[PDB]
Amino acid sequence: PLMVKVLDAVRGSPAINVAVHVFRKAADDTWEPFASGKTSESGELHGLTTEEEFVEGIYKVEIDTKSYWKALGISPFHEHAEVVFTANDSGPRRYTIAALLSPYSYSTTAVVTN
Amino acid sequence: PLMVKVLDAVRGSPAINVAVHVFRKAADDTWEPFASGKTSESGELHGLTTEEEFVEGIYKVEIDTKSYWKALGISPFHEHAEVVFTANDSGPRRYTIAALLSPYSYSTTAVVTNP
Amino acid sequence: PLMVKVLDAVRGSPAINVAVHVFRKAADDTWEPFASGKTSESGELHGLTTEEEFVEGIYKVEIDTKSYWKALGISPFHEHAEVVFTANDSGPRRYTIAALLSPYSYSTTAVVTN
Amino acid sequence: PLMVKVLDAVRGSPAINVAVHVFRKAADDTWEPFASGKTSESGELHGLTTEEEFVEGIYKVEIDTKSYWKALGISPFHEHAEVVFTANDSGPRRYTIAALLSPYSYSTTAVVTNP
Numbered sequence: 532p533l534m535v536k537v538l539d540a541v542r543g544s545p546a547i548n549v550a551v552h553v554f555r556k557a558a559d560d561t562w563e564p565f566a567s568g569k570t571s572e573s574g575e576l577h578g579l580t581t582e583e584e585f586v587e588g589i590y591k592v593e594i595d596t597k598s599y600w601k602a603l604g605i606s607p608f609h610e611h612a613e614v615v616f617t618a619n620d621s622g623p624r625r626y627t628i629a630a631l632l633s634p635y636s637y638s639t640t641a642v643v644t645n
Numbered sequence: 646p647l648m649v650k651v652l653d654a655v656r657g658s659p660a661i662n663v664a665v666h667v668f669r670k671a672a673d674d675t676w677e678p679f680a681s682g683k684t685s686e687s688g689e690l691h692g693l694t695t696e697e698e699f700v701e702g703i704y705k706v707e708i709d710t711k712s713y714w715k716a717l718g719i720s721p722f723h724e725h726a727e728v729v730f731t732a733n734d735s736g737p738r739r740y741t742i743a744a745l746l747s748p749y750s751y752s753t754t755a756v757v758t759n760p
Numbered sequence: 761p762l763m764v765k766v767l768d769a770v771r772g773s774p775a776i777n778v779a780v781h782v783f784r785k786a787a788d789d790t791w792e793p794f795a796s797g798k799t800s801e802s803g804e805l806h807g808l809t810t811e812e813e814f815v816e817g818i819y820k821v822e823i824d825t826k827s828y829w830k831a832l833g834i835s836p837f838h839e840h841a842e843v844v845f846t847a848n849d850s851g852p853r854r855y856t857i858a859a860l861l862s863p864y865s866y867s868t869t870a871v872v873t874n
Numbered sequence: 875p876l877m878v879k880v881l882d883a884v885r886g887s888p889a890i891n892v893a894v895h896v897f898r899k900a901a902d903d904t905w906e907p908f909a910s911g912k913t914s915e916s917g918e919l920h921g922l923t924t925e926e927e928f929v930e931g932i933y934k935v936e937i938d939t940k941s942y943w944k945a946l947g948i949s950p951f952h953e954h955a956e957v958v959f960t961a962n963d964s965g966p967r968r969y970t971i972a973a974l975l976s977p978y979s980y981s982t983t984a985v986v987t988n989p
C-alpha cells in the first residue's frame with residue numbers, strides 16, 4: 532500500500548541505500564514511528580506496511596538526504612526531505628511517494644493508483 | 646536574511662496568501678516557533694527575521710500548501726511542504742527558499758548568498 | 761534500451777495515453793523520426809527501440825503535453841515538452857526519461873542504469 | 875515582456891552566464907531566430923524583446939544547459955532545455971520562464987501576468 536522511490540538528479544540514477552523513516556501522527560500531535568528501511572539498488576523501498584496496518588491518518592516520510600550526499604562527498608543544503616500527507620480511503624489504494632534529489636533542491640510527487 | 650518565494654504550477658502565477666511558519670530547533674530538541682507570515686501578491690515573503698536574530702541553528706520552513714489549495718477549493722495531497730536546513734554555521738548568509746506547488750507535488754530549492 | 765515514464769502532478773497519477781515522439785538528429789542537423797507511441801495505463805512507453813537500432817547520437821523525446829491537458833479540460837502553457845540528450849556508449853546501457861507534468865510547469869530527469 | 879531566470883540546484887545559486895536563444899515559428903513552420911542573450915550574476919536575462927516586437931506566435935526558449943555545465947567542467951545529460959509555448963494570443967502578457975538545473979535533470983515553470 533505504501534512505496535517510496537528516490538532518484539538522484541546529479542548522477543542520473545536511483546538513490547541507493549538512502550534511509551527512510553515513516554511516522555504516523557498520534558492523537559497528541561506527536562510523530563510515532565511507523566516503518567523504516569533503506570532504499571534498494573533500484574531506489575525503492577517496499578514492504579513498509581500492510582493494508583491492515585495502513586489506516587487513514589497523517590503520515591510523514593522522512594528521507595535522509597544529508598547522509599546520502601555526504602557519502603558522495605557533496606555538501607547539501609537540507610537536513611532531510613519530509614513528505615507529510617493524509618492517507619484517505621475514499622481515494623485510490625496504493626501510494627507511491629517519489630522524490631528527486633539534488634544537493635540544494637528536491638522535488639516530490641505522489642502517484643496514487645488502484 | 647531569509648526570504649520565501651512560492652509559485653503555482655497550475656495557474657502559472659505567484660502563489661499568493663500562502664501561510665509560512667518558521668521554527669528553530671532548541672537545545673532540548675524541540676521546534677521553537679521563530680517567525681511567520683504570508684506571501685504577498687508577488688508570492689514573496691520578506692521581513693521574517695533580522696541578521697541579529699537569525700543566528701546559527703537548524704531551521705524548519707513550513708509552507709502551508711494544504712491551506713493554500715483548500716482556500717482555492719482544491720483537495721491536495723500534502724499537508725504542507727517542510728524545508729529543514731542548517732543556517733549560518735559558517736557565518737551569516739542570505740537564504741531564499743523557493744517552492745513550486747501542484748496539488749500532488751512540490752519542488753523546493755534554496756539560493757544561498759554571502760553578503 | 762529506452763523507456764519513457766510520464767506522471768501527472770495535478771491528479772497524482774500516471775499520465776495515460778500521452779503521445780510521445782522520438783527523433784534522432786541527422787547529419788544535416790534535421791530531426792528524423794525514430795520511434796513513437798502512447799503511454800500506457802502506468803504512464804510508460806516501452807518498446808521504442810532495440811539495442812541494435814539505438815546507436816550513439818542526439819535524440820529528442822517530444823511529449824504531447826498540450827493534448828493531454830486539453831483532454832482534461834485544462835488550458836496549459838506549453839506546446840509540448842522536449843527532452844534532448846546524447847546517447848553515449850561509455851555510460852550505462854538503459855535510459856529512462858521521466859517527466860512530471862503540471863499545466864504551467866514540467867520537470868524531467870534521466871535514470872541511466874546497467 | 876519576456877524574462878528568463880535560471881537557478882543551479884547543485885550550488886544553490888543563480889546559474890550565471892547561461893546562454894539563451896529564443897526562436898519564433900514562421901508561417902512556413904521553420905524556427906526563426908528571435909532574440910538571444912545570457913543570464914547575469916543574478917541568473918536573470920532581461921531585454922530580449924519589446925512589447926512591439928513580441929507579437930502573437932509560438933516561441934521556443936532554448937536554455938543552453940550543456941554549455942553551462944561543460945563551462946563548469948561537468949558532463950551533463952541534456953543538450954539544452956527547450957520551453958515551447960504560444961504567447962500573446964489573448965493580447966499582450968508578460969512572461970517569466972524559470973528553470974532549475976541539475977546535471978541529469980531540469981524543471982521549468984512559467985509565470986504569466988497581465989499588465
Ligand SMILES: *S(=O)(=O)c1cccc(-c2nnc(-c3cc(Cl)cc(Cl)c3)o2)c1
Binds near residue numbers: 538640856
Ligand atoms: S517506474 O516505477 O519504473 C519509474 C522509473 C523511473 C522513474 C520513475 C519516477 N517516479 N517518480 C519520478 C519523478 C519524480 C519527480 Cl519528483 C520528478 C521527476 Cl522529473 C520524476 O520518476 C518511476
Ligand SMILES: *S(=O)(=O)c1cccc(-c2nnc(-c3cc(Cl)cc(Cl)c3)o2)c1
Binds near residue numbers: 743982
Ligand atoms: S525573480 O525573483 O525575478 C524570479 C521570478 C520568477 C520566478 C523565480 C523563481 N524562483 N524559484 C523558482 C523555481 C523554483 C523551483 Cl523549486 C522550480 C522552478 Cl522551475 C523555479 O523560480 C524568481
